[PDB]
Structures are given as structure tokens and as C-alpha cells.
Amino acid sequence: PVDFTGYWKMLVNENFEEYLRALDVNVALRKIANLLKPDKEIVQDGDHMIIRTLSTFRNYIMDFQVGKEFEEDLTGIDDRKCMTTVSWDGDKLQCVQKGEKEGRGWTQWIEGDELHLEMRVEGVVCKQVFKKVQHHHHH
């Protein structure tokens, strides 16, 4: 069992530039984006997941049911549209984002007080780790 509910602060963000390059993000937007250290606010409510990614530049929200394909109209910093399914794989969440790019998806899991997120596209891998935190602010 796992419960992702909580507020999480970015600790590391590895190889994000290459990932954004694979998504054709203008080198200019790559500089903006790799300086951001977003927080994640997650509510796991049964198999209904809400994952908010919160930064000083843009907020994102993923709102889905585990196992149910959905249209992800604002998938990431590249703002492509994907048909996305997030499934359980044991205690990991496995996401496939079907769309214009091959092999796009991510895997999310918890180790201790760390939220681990591996993002993939076209063979490129970016790894993020967040730490669970308790000081909350309105958004």
C-alpha cells in the first residue's frame, strides 16, 4: 500500500534540460523552466488522484481516476495534448501519455519521506525527488 497525499518540495531535478529538448521546448523556455523548483500538492482519494504542480511561473493540475484514460489538455511545459492513463504497478503509479511523442510517460513512487518521479520521452530520462513538508500556504 501507498498514499501519495501530502505537500512535497523539490529537492533535485536531474537531466530536465535534455528532457525539455526532446519535447522541442525553445532553448529560451528551457532556461526559464529549469530554474523553477515546483512544489507538488497531492490528494489521493480512493483511486481519484489530484496532483497539483505549483510554481511561480505556472500551476498545473492533473485530476484523474487510476486506470481510466483521460484527455490531458495541458500535459506539461510543452503544452501538447495527450491521451493519458495512470495505472497502479504495485505501489508505483505508472503513467503513459499517448500523443505526438514516442515513449512519453512517467513513474511515481515513495521512498521514506521522498516522492520520486521519473519522467521519460523519446528515450530521455529526467529524475525528480521531492521531500514531504508541513508548512502549507494557500494557492
mmCIF file of N, CA and C in Angstrom:
data_model
loop_
_atom_site.group_PDB
_atom_site.id
_atom_site.type_symbol
_atom_site.label_atom_id
_atom_site.label_comp_id
_atom_site.label_asym_id
_atom_site.label_seq_id
_atom_site.Cartn_x
_atom_site.Cartn_y
_atom_site.Cartn_z
ATOM 1 N N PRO A 1 0.819 -1.213 0.000
ATOM 2 C CA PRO A 1 0.000 0.000 0.000
ATOM 3 C C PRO A 1 0.846 1.251 0.000
ATOM 4 N N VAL A 2 0.273 2.301 -0.571
ATOM 5 C CA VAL A 2 0.910 3.613 -0.626
ATOM 6 C C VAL A 2 -0.171 4.686 -0.647
ATOM 7 N N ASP A 3 0.152 5.834 -0.075
ATOM 8 C CA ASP A 3 -0.724 7.001 -0.143
ATOM 9 C C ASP A 3 0.158 8.202 -0.429
ATOM 10 N N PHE A 4 -0.049 8.830 -1.586
ATOM 11 C CA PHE A 4 0.738 9.966 -2.030
ATOM 12 C C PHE A 4 0.276 11.304 -1.448
ATOM 13 N N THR A 5 -0.824 11.324 -0.698
ATOM 14 C CA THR A 5 -1.370 12.574 -0.180
ATOM 15 C C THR A 5 -0.306 13.331 0.591
ATOM 16 N N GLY A 6 -0.181 14.614 0.303
ATOM 17 C CA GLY A 6 0.739 15.455 1.048
ATOM 18 C C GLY A 6 1.206 16.622 0.199
ATOM 19 N N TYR A 7 2.071 17.410 0.808
ATOM 20 C CA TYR A 7 2.691 18.567 0.195
ATOM 21 C C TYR A 7 4.179 18.250 0.113
ATOM 22 N N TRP A 8 4.776 18.502 -1.039
ATOM 23 C CA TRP A 8 6.102 17.988 -1.368
ATOM 24 C C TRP A 8 6.917 19.078 -2.035
ATOM 25 N N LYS A 9 8.140 19.269 -1.600
ATOM 26 C CA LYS A 9 9.011 20.310 -2.098
ATOM 27 C C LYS A 9 10.173 19.720 -2.900
ATOM 28 N N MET A 10 10.480 20.312 -4.055
ATOM 29 C CA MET A 10 11.520 19.762 -4.916
ATOM 30 C C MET A 10 12.885 19.836 -4.249
ATOM 31 N N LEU A 11 13.587 18.698 -4.236
ATOM 32 C CA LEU A 11 14.944 18.601 -3.739
ATOM 33 C C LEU A 11 15.951 18.558 -4.875
ATOM 34 N N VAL A 12 15.707 17.706 -5.874
ATOM 35 C CA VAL A 12 16.576 17.574 -7.041
ATOM 36 C C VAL A 12 15.722 17.446 -8.295
ATOM 37 N N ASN A 13 16.342 17.821 -9.416
ATOM 38 C CA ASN A 13 15.714 17.752 -10.733
ATOM 39 C C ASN A 13 16.850 17.497 -11.725
ATOM 40 N N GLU A 14 16.998 16.244 -12.108
ATOM 41 C CA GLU A 14 18.141 15.752 -12.848
ATOM 42 C C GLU A 14 17.789 15.557 -14.322
ATOM 43 N N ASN A 15 18.613 16.129 -15.189
ATOM 44 C CA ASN A 15 18.524 15.958 -16.643
ATOM 45 C C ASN A 15 17.257 16.556 -17.248
ATOM 46 N N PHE A 16 16.701 17.597 -16.623
ATOM 47 C CA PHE A 16 15.485 18.220 -17.136
ATOM 48 C C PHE A 16 15.715 18.937 -18.461
ATOM 49 N N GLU A 17 16.900 19.528 -18.664
ATOM 50 C CA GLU A 17 17.190 20.222 -19.922
ATOM 51 C C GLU A 17 17.053 19.287 -21.120
ATOM 52 N N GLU A 18 17.691 18.117 -21.053
ATOM 53 C CA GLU A 18 17.612 17.151 -22.152
ATOM 54 C C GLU A 18 16.174 16.725 -22.381
ATOM 55 N N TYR A 19 15.432 16.492 -21.299
ATOM 56 C CA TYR A 19 14.023 16.132 -21.417
ATOM 57 C C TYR A 19 13.248 17.200 -22.170
ATOM 58 N N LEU A 20 13.413 18.462 -21.774
ATOM 59 C CA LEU A 20 12.712 19.545 -22.463
ATOM 60 C C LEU A 20 13.163 19.689 -23.908
ATOM 61 N N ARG A 21 14.442 19.438 -24.181
ATOM 62 C CA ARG A 21 14.925 19.453 -25.559
ATOM 63 C C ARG A 21 14.212 18.393 -26.389
ATOM 64 N N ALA A 22 14.010 17.204 -25.814
ATOM 65 C CA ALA A 22 13.281 16.156 -26.524
ATOM 66 C C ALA A 22 11.836 16.546 -26.789
ATOM 67 N N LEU A 23 11.282 17.452 -25.994
ATOM 68 C CA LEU A 23 9.946 17.964 -26.215
ATOM 69 C C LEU A 23 9.932 19.207 -27.092
ATOM 70 N N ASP A 24 11.068 19.544 -27.705
ATOM 71 C CA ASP A 24 11.193 20.662 -28.641
ATOM 72 C C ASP A 24 10.987 22.020 -27.990
ATOM 73 N N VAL A 25 11.145 22.100 -26.670
ATOM 74 C CA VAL A 25 10.987 23.370 -25.981
ATOM 75 C C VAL A 25 12.095 24.304 -26.427
ATOM 76 N N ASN A 26 11.709 25.507 -26.860
ATOM 77 C CA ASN A 26 12.672 26.521 -27.273
ATOM 78 C C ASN A 26 13.755 26.653 -26.220
ATOM 79 N N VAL A 27 15.010 26.698 -26.672
ATOM 80 C CA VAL A 27 16.115 26.796 -25.720
ATOM 81 C C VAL A 27 15.855 27.935 -24.742
ATOM 82 N N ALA A 28 15.163 28.983 -25.199
ATOM 83 C CA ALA A 28 14.818 30.098 -24.322
ATOM 84 C C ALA A 28 13.878 29.659 -23.201
ATOM 85 N N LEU A 29 12.813 28.929 -23.539
ATOM 86 C CA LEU A 29 11.911 28.457 -22.497
ATOM 87 C C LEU A 29 12.587 27.416 -21.606
ATOM 88 N N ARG A 30 13.625 26.733 -22.113
ATOM 89 C CA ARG A 30 14.348 25.759 -21.301
ATOM 90 C C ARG A 30 15.030 26.434 -20.120
ATOM 91 N N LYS A 31 15.608 27.617 -20.346
ATOM 92 C CA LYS A 31 16.248 28.361 -19.265
ATOM 93 C C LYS A 31 15.236 28.765 -18.198
ATOM 94 N N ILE A 32 14.109 29.360 -18.612
ATOM 95 C CA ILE A 32 13.032 29.657 -17.667
ATOM 96 C C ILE A 32 12.719 28.416 -16.842
ATOM 97 N N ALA A 33 12.469 27.299 -17.526
ATOM 98 C CA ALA A 33 11.868 26.144 -16.872
ATOM 99 C C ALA A 33 12.847 25.426 -15.947
ATOM 100 N N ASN A 34 14.126 25.329 -16.333
ATOM 101 C CA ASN A 34 14.998 24.568 -15.442
ATOM 102 C C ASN A 34 15.338 25.327 -14.165
ATOM 103 N N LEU A 35 15.041 26.632 -14.068
ATOM 104 C CA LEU A 35 15.235 27.369 -12.821
ATOM 105 C C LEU A 35 14.098 27.170 -11.841
ATOM 106 N N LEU A 36 12.951 26.684 -12.301
ATOM 107 C CA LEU A 36 11.791 26.519 -11.436
ATOM 108 C C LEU A 36 11.953 25.294 -10.557
ATOM 109 N N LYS A 37 11.515 25.429 -9.311
ATOM 110 C CA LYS A 37 11.531 24.347 -8.326
ATOM 111 C C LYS A 37 10.104 24.185 -7.811
ATOM 112 N N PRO A 38 9.234 23.565 -8.592
ATOM 113 C CA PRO A 38 7.823 23.480 -8.201
ATOM 114 C C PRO A 38 7.618 22.604 -6.986
ATOM 115 N N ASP A 39 6.564 22.914 -6.238
ATOM 116 C CA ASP A 39 6.048 22.032 -5.208
ATOM 117 C C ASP A 39 4.987 21.125 -5.840
ATOM 118 N N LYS A 40 4.678 20.021 -5.169
ATOM 119 C CA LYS A 40 3.562 19.168 -5.550
ATOM 120 C C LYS A 40 2.600 19.083 -4.372
ATOM 121 N N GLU A 41 1.309 19.263 -4.640
ATOM 122 C CA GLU A 41 0.272 19.062 -3.634
ATOM 123 C C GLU A 41 -0.621 17.959 -4.168
ATOM 124 N N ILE A 42 -0.693 16.829 -3.440
ATOM 125 C CA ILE A 42 -1.375 15.635 -3.908
ATOM 126 C C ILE A 42 -2.461 15.251 -2.926
ATOM 127 N N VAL A 43 -3.638 14.925 -3.458
ATOM 128 C CA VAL A 43 -4.696 14.275 -2.686
ATOM 129 C C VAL A 43 -5.050 12.969 -3.384
ATOM 130 N N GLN A 44 -4.824 11.856 -2.693
ATOM 131 C CA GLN A 44 -5.254 10.536 -3.146
ATOM 132 C C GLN A 44 -6.530 10.191 -2.389
ATOM 133 N N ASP A 45 -7.619 10.021 -3.123
ATOM 134 C CA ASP A 45 -8.973 9.888 -2.556
ATOM 135 C C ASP A 45 -9.557 8.632 -3.204
ATOM 136 N N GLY A 46 -9.352 7.494 -2.575
ATOM 137 C CA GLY A 46 -9.628 6.250 -3.268
ATOM 138 C C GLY A 46 -8.688 6.115 -4.444
ATOM 139 N N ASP A 47 -9.254 5.861 -5.614
ATOM 140 C CA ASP A 47 -8.482 5.818 -6.846
ATOM 141 C C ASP A 47 -8.599 7.123 -7.636
ATOM 142 N N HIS A 48 -9.185 8.163 -7.040
ATOM 143 C CA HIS A 48 -9.216 9.505 -7.615
ATOM 144 C C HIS A 48 -7.999 10.277 -7.112
ATOM 145 N N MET A 49 -7.114 10.663 -8.019
ATOM 146 C CA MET A 49 -5.884 11.372 -7.709
ATOM 147 C C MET A 49 -5.947 12.791 -8.233
ATOM 148 N N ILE A 50 -5.508 13.741 -7.421
ATOM 149 C CA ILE A 50 -5.286 15.104 -7.857
ATOM 150 C C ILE A 50 -3.838 15.436 -7.532
ATOM 151 N N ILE A 51 -3.079 15.802 -8.553
ATOM 152 C CA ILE A 51 -1.680 16.175 -8.421
ATOM 153 C C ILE A 51 -1.574 17.587 -8.959
ATOM 154 N N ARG A 52 -1.297 18.544 -8.084
ATOM 155 C CA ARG A 52 -1.080 19.934 -8.454
ATOM 156 C C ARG A 52 0.411 20.204 -8.421
ATOM 157 N N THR A 53 0.924 20.757 -9.494
ATOM 158 C CA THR A 53 2.324 21.156 -9.568
ATOM 159 C C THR A 53 2.361 22.675 -9.575
ATOM 160 N N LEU A 54 2.990 23.254 -8.551
ATOM 161 C CA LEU A 54 2.818 24.661 -8.191
ATOM 162 C C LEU A 54 4.143 25.397 -8.282
ATOM 163 N N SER A 55 4.203 26.441 -9.102
ATOM 164 C CA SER A 55 5.410 27.244 -9.204
ATOM 165 C C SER A 55 5.043 28.703 -9.387
ATOM 166 N N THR A 56 6.081 29.535 -9.310
ATOM 167 C CA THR A 56 5.956 30.967 -9.508
ATOM 168 C C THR A 56 5.661 31.336 -10.955
ATOM 169 N N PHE A 57 5.808 30.408 -11.897
ATOM 170 C CA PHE A 57 5.580 30.657 -13.318
ATOM 171 C C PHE A 57 4.209 30.191 -13.796
ATOM 172 N N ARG A 58 3.768 29.011 -13.377
ATOM 173 C CA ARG A 58 2.569 28.369 -13.889
ATOM 174 C C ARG A 58 2.218 27.260 -12.912
ATOM 175 N N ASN A 59 0.926 27.069 -12.662
ATOM 176 C CA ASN A 59 0.456 25.904 -11.949
ATOM 177 C C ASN A 59 -0.125 24.926 -12.956
ATOM 178 N N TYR A 60 0.020 23.647 -12.646
ATOM 179 C CA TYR A 60 -0.568 22.579 -13.427
ATOM 180 C C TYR A 60 -1.417 21.738 -12.483
ATOM 181 N N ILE A 61 -2.435 21.107 -13.022
ATOM 182 C CA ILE A 61 -3.250 20.191 -12.244
ATOM 183 C C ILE A 61 -3.559 18.986 -13.100
ATOM 184 N N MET A 62 -3.303 17.814 -12.548
ATOM 185 C CA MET A 62 -3.723 16.534 -13.090
ATOM 186 C C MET A 62 -4.794 15.995 -12.178
ATOM 187 N N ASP A 63 -5.948 15.689 -12.740
ATOM 188 C CA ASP A 63 -7.102 15.214 -11.988
ATOM 189 C C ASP A 63 -7.613 14.000 -12.753
ATOM 190 N N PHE A 64 -7.483 12.813 -12.171
ATOM 191 C CA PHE A 64 -7.772 11.594 -12.904
ATOM 192 C C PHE A 64 -8.191 10.461 -11.977
ATOM 193 N N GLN A 65 -8.711 9.415 -12.598
ATOM 194 C CA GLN A 65 -9.029 8.178 -11.921
ATOM 195 C C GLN A 65 -7.999 7.151 -12.364
ATOM 196 N N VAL A 66 -7.348 6.494 -11.409
ATOM 197 C CA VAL A 66 -6.382 5.457 -11.768
ATOM 198 C C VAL A 66 -7.073 4.407 -12.627
ATOM 199 N N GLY A 67 -6.458 4.100 -13.776
ATOM 200 C CA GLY A 67 -6.943 3.118 -14.732
ATOM 201 C C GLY A 67 -7.824 3.658 -15.840
ATOM 202 N N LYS A 68 -8.215 4.920 -15.791
ATOM 203 C CA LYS A 68 -9.164 5.489 -16.741
ATOM 204 C C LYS A 68 -8.458 6.503 -17.629
ATOM 205 N N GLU A 69 -8.468 6.241 -18.931
ATOM 206 C CA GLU A 69 -7.840 7.151 -19.872
ATOM 207 C C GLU A 69 -8.561 8.489 -19.861
ATOM 208 N N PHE A 70 -7.781 9.561 -19.991
ATOM 209 C CA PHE A 70 -8.326 10.910 -19.962
ATOM 210 C C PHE A 70 -7.528 11.799 -20.895
ATOM 211 N N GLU A 71 -8.181 12.858 -21.349
ATOM 212 C CA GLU A 71 -7.526 13.851 -22.187
ATOM 213 C C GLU A 71 -6.780 14.836 -21.298
ATOM 214 N N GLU A 72 -5.474 14.902 -21.499
ATOM 215 C CA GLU A 72 -4.569 15.735 -20.712
ATOM 216 C C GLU A 72 -4.265 16.903 -21.640
ATOM 217 N N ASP A 73 -5.073 17.970 -21.507
ATOM 218 C CA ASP A 73 -5.043 19.111 -22.416
ATOM 219 C C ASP A 73 -3.858 20.024 -22.165
ATOM 220 N N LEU A 74 -3.235 19.913 -21.001
ATOM 221 C CA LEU A 74 -2.108 20.763 -20.630
ATOM 222 C C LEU A 74 -1.144 19.793 -19.956
ATOM 223 N N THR A 75 -0.324 19.126 -20.773
ATOM 224 C CA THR A 75 0.438 17.980 -20.280
ATOM 225 C C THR A 75 1.681 18.412 -19.533
ATOM 226 N N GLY A 76 2.298 19.493 -19.971
ATOM 227 C CA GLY A 76 3.495 19.964 -19.316
ATOM 228 C C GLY A 76 3.932 21.292 -19.867
ATOM 229 N N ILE A 77 5.205 21.608 -19.620
ATOM 230 C CA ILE A 77 5.755 22.871 -20.086
ATOM 231 C C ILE A 77 5.643 23.010 -21.603
ATOM 232 N N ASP A 78 5.514 21.895 -22.339
ATOM 233 C CA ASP A 78 5.377 21.966 -23.790
ATOM 234 C C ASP A 78 3.946 22.189 -24.258
ATOM 235 N N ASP A 79 2.963 22.084 -23.362
ATOM 236 C CA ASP A 79 1.540 22.316 -23.680
ATOM 237 C C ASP A 79 1.072 21.604 -24.960
ATOM 238 N N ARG A 80 1.488 20.351 -25.123
ATOM 239 C CA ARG A 80 0.849 19.424 -26.051
ATOM 240 C C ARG A 80 -0.324 18.735 -25.353
ATOM 241 N N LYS A 81 -1.241 18.195 -26.153
ATOM 242 C CA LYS A 81 -2.371 17.423 -25.649
ATOM 243 C C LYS A 81 -2.077 15.935 -25.802
ATOM 244 N N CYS A 82 -2.371 15.161 -24.761
ATOM 245 C CA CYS A 82 -2.142 13.722 -24.763
ATOM 246 C C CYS A 82 -3.377 13.008 -24.235
ATOM 247 N N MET A 83 -3.501 11.739 -24.611
ATOM 248 C CA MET A 83 -4.480 10.833 -24.028
ATOM 249 C C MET A 83 -3.695 9.972 -23.043
ATOM 250 N N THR A 84 -3.984 10.157 -21.770
ATOM 251 C CA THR A 84 -3.147 9.677 -20.683
ATOM 252 C C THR A 84 -3.891 8.643 -19.856
ATOM 253 N N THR A 85 -3.169 7.583 -19.460
ATOM 254 C CA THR A 85 -3.660 6.609 -18.487
ATOM 255 C C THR A 85 -2.617 6.432 -17.390
ATOM 256 N N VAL A 86 -3.060 6.535 -16.150
ATOM 257 C CA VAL A 86 -2.212 6.288 -14.997
ATOM 258 C C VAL A 86 -2.737 5.041 -14.319
ATOM 259 N N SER A 87 -1.862 4.077 -14.116
ATOM 260 C CA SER A 87 -2.211 2.769 -13.589
ATOM 261 C C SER A 87 -1.336 2.454 -12.380
ATOM 262 N N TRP A 88 -1.852 1.620 -11.483
ATOM 263 C CA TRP A 88 -1.030 1.085 -10.417
ATOM 264 C C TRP A 88 -0.090 0.022 -10.966
ATOM 265 N N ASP A 89 1.131 0.028 -10.470
ATOM 266 C CA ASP A 89 2.086 -1.061 -10.709
ATOM 267 C C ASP A 89 2.667 -1.359 -9.331
ATOM 268 N N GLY A 90 1.985 -2.216 -8.579
ATOM 269 C CA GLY A 90 2.306 -2.366 -7.167
ATOM 270 C C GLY A 90 2.075 -1.038 -6.461
ATOM 271 N N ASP A 91 3.062 -0.592 -5.686
ATOM 272 C CA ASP A 91 2.990 0.698 -5.012
ATOM 273 C C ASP A 91 3.493 1.869 -5.869
ATOM 274 N N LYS A 92 3.742 1.660 -7.144
ATOM 275 C CA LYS A 92 4.126 2.729 -8.042
ATOM 276 C C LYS A 92 2.943 3.135 -8.910
ATOM 277 N N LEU A 93 2.915 4.398 -9.310
ATOM 278 C CA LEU A 93 1.979 4.889 -10.313
ATOM 279 C C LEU A 93 2.719 5.000 -11.633
ATOM 280 N N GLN A 94 2.178 4.361 -12.657
ATOM 281 C CA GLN A 94 2.775 4.316 -13.990
ATOM 282 C C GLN A 94 1.879 5.080 -14.950
ATOM 283 N N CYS A 95 2.428 6.097 -15.591
ATOM 284 C CA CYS A 95 1.667 6.944 -16.500
ATOM 285 C C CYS A 95 2.175 6.784 -17.925
ATOM 286 N N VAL A 96 1.251 6.537 -18.860
ATOM 287 C CA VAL A 96 1.525 6.569 -20.293
ATOM 288 C C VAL A 96 0.750 7.722 -20.908
ATOM 289 N N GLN A 97 1.448 8.566 -21.667
ATOM 290 C CA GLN A 97 0.889 9.763 -22.291
ATOM 291 C C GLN A 97 0.953 9.556 -23.798
ATOM 292 N N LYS A 98 -0.174 9.134 -24.383
ATOM 293 C CA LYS A 98 -0.213 8.848 -25.811
ATOM 294 C C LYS A 98 -0.433 10.130 -26.600
ATOM 295 N N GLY A 99 0.426 10.357 -27.589
ATOM 296 C CA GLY A 99 0.353 11.593 -28.357
ATOM 297 C C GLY A 99 1.491 11.703 -29.351
ATOM 298 N N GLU A 100 1.902 12.951 -29.599
ATOM 299 C CA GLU A 100 2.795 13.244 -30.713
ATOM 300 C C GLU A 100 4.207 12.723 -30.497
ATOM 301 N N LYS A 101 4.572 12.380 -29.267
ATOM 302 C CA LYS A 101 5.916 11.928 -28.950
ATOM 303 C C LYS A 101 5.913 10.473 -28.501
ATOM 304 N N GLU A 102 6.924 9.735 -28.935
ATOM 305 C CA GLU A 102 7.059 8.331 -28.592
ATOM 306 C C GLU A 102 7.542 8.174 -27.152
ATOM 307 N N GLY A 103 7.064 7.114 -26.503
ATOM 308 C CA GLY A 103 7.600 6.689 -25.219
ATOM 309 C C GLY A 103 7.448 7.708 -24.119
ATOM 310 N N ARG A 104 6.391 8.509 -24.163
ATOM 311 C CA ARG A 104 6.183 9.565 -23.189
ATOM 312 C C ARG A 104 5.404 9.021 -22.000
ATOM 313 N N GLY A 105 5.927 9.262 -20.802
ATOM 314 C CA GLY A 105 5.243 8.835 -19.596
ATOM 315 C C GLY A 105 6.068 9.146 -18.371
ATOM 316 N N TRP A 106 5.624 8.608 -17.240
ATOM 317 C CA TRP A 106 6.366 8.789 -16.006
ATOM 318 C C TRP A 106 6.025 7.672 -15.033
ATOM 319 N N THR A 107 6.870 7.539 -14.003
ATOM 320 C CA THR A 107 6.638 6.625 -12.893
ATOM 321 C C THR A 107 6.840 7.402 -11.604
ATOM 322 N N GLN A 108 5.917 7.246 -10.662
ATOM 323 C CA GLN A 108 5.995 7.962 -9.399
ATOM 324 C C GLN A 108 5.910 6.950 -8.274
ATOM 325 N N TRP A 109 6.699 7.165 -7.233
ATOM 326 C CA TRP A 109 6.735 6.253 -6.096
ATOM 327 C C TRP A 109 7.222 7.024 -4.869
ATOM 328 N N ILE A 110 7.108 6.396 -3.696
ATOM 329 C CA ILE A 110 7.572 6.964 -2.440
ATOM 330 C C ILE A 110 8.661 6.071 -1.865
ATOM 331 N N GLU A 111 9.726 6.706 -1.371
ATOM 332 C CA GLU A 111 10.722 6.050 -0.517
ATOM 333 C C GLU A 111 10.866 6.886 0.749
ATOM 334 N N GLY A 112 10.373 6.387 1.877
ATOM 335 C CA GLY A 112 10.532 7.160 3.099
ATOM 336 C C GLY A 112 9.736 8.442 3.010
ATOM 337 N N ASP A 113 10.396 9.592 3.213
ATOM 338 C CA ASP A 113 9.756 10.902 3.108
ATOM 339 C C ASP A 113 10.003 11.564 1.763
ATOM 340 N N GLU A 114 10.412 10.777 0.771
ATOM 341 C CA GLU A 114 10.707 11.238 -0.578
ATOM 342 C C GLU A 114 9.655 10.758 -1.576
ATOM 343 N N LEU A 115 9.213 11.680 -2.395
ATOM 344 C CA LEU A 115 8.417 11.398 -3.576
ATOM 345 C C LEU A 115 9.364 11.390 -4.776
ATOM 346 N N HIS A 116 9.415 10.267 -5.470
ATOM 347 C CA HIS A 116 10.277 10.039 -6.623
ATOM 348 C C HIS A 116 9.440 10.095 -7.890
ATOM 349 N N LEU A 117 9.917 10.832 -8.878
ATOM 350 C CA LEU A 117 9.204 10.979 -10.137
ATOM 351 C C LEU A 117 10.210 10.863 -11.281
ATOM 352 N N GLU A 118 10.084 9.813 -12.087
ATOM 353 C CA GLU A 118 10.893 9.623 -13.279
ATOM 354 C C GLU A 118 10.040 9.951 -14.497
ATOM 355 N N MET A 119 10.465 10.928 -15.289
ATOM 356 C CA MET A 119 9.764 11.340 -16.499
ATOM 357 C C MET A 119 10.563 10.909 -17.722
ATOM 358 N N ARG A 120 9.865 10.428 -18.740
ATOM 359 C CA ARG A 120 10.502 9.864 -19.917
ATOM 360 C C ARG A 120 9.823 10.365 -21.182
ATOM 361 N N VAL A 121 10.632 10.564 -22.210
ATOM 362 C CA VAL A 121 10.123 10.820 -23.548
ATOM 363 C C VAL A 121 11.228 10.516 -24.543
ATOM 364 N N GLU A 122 10.895 9.779 -25.609
ATOM 365 C CA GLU A 122 11.831 9.512 -26.709
ATOM 366 C C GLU A 122 13.180 9.021 -26.193
ATOM 367 N N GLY A 123 13.143 8.180 -25.161
ATOM 368 C CA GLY A 123 14.341 7.591 -24.599
ATOM 369 C C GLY A 123 15.107 8.444 -23.610
ATOM 370 N N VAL A 124 14.745 9.691 -23.436
ATOM 371 C CA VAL A 124 15.385 10.598 -22.492
ATOM 372 C C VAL A 124 14.699 10.465 -21.136
ATOM 373 N N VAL A 125 15.486 10.499 -20.057
ATOM 374 C CA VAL A 125 15.007 10.284 -18.692
ATOM 375 C C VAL A 125 15.387 11.466 -17.806
ATOM 376 N N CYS A 126 14.390 12.047 -17.137
ATOM 377 C CA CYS A 126 14.585 13.066 -16.111
ATOM 378 C C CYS A 126 14.100 12.512 -14.783
ATOM 379 N N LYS A 127 14.866 12.743 -13.724
ATOM 380 C CA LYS A 127 14.528 12.239 -12.400
ATOM 381 C C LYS A 127 14.388 13.380 -11.408
ATOM 382 N N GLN A 128 13.242 13.444 -10.739
ATOM 383 C CA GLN A 128 12.961 14.424 -9.705
ATOM 384 C C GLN A 128 12.713 13.720 -8.381
ATOM 385 N N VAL A 129 13.173 14.341 -7.303
ATOM 386 C CA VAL A 129 12.868 13.887 -5.956
ATOM 387 C C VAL A 129 12.357 15.078 -5.181
ATOM 388 N N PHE A 130 11.276 14.856 -4.430
ATOM 389 C CA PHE A 130 10.650 15.853 -3.575
ATOM 390 C C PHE A 130 10.668 15.335 -2.145
ATOM 391 N N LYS A 131 10.740 16.251 -1.183
ATOM 392 C CA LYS A 131 10.660 15.915 0.226
ATOM 393 C C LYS A 131 9.318 16.350 0.792
ATOM 394 N N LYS A 132 8.734 15.494 1.621
ATOM 395 C CA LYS A 132 7.455 15.807 2.260
ATOM 396 C C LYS A 132 7.659 16.945 3.247
ATOM 397 N N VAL A 133 6.781 17.944 3.171
ATOM 398 C CA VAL A 133 6.873 19.132 4.011
ATOM 399 C C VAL A 133 5.525 19.426 4.657
ATOM 400 N N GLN A 134 5.552 20.264 5.689
ATOM 401 C CA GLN A 134 4.374 20.504 6.504
ATOM 402 C C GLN A 134 3.945 21.952 6.581
ATOM 403 N N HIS A 135 4.764 22.908 6.137
ATOM 404 C CA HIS A 135 4.361 24.304 6.137
ATOM 405 C C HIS A 135 3.582 24.566 4.861
ATOM 406 N N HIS A 136 2.311 24.881 5.005
ATOM 407 C CA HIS A 136 1.445 24.986 3.846
ATOM 408 C C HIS A 136 1.052 26.434 3.658
ATOM 409 N N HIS A 137 0.817 26.808 2.405
ATOM 410 C CA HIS A 137 0.326 28.134 2.058
ATOM 411 C C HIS A 137 -0.803 27.972 1.054
ATOM 412 N N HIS A 138 -1.705 28.955 1.043
ATOM 413 C CA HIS A 138 -2.821 28.966 0.108
ATOM 414 C C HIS A 138 -2.304 29.017 -1.322
ATOM 415 N N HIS A 139 -3.078 28.435 -2.232
ATOM 416 C CA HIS A 139 -2.839 28.603 -3.667
ATOM 417 C C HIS A 139 -4.154 28.821 -4.412
#
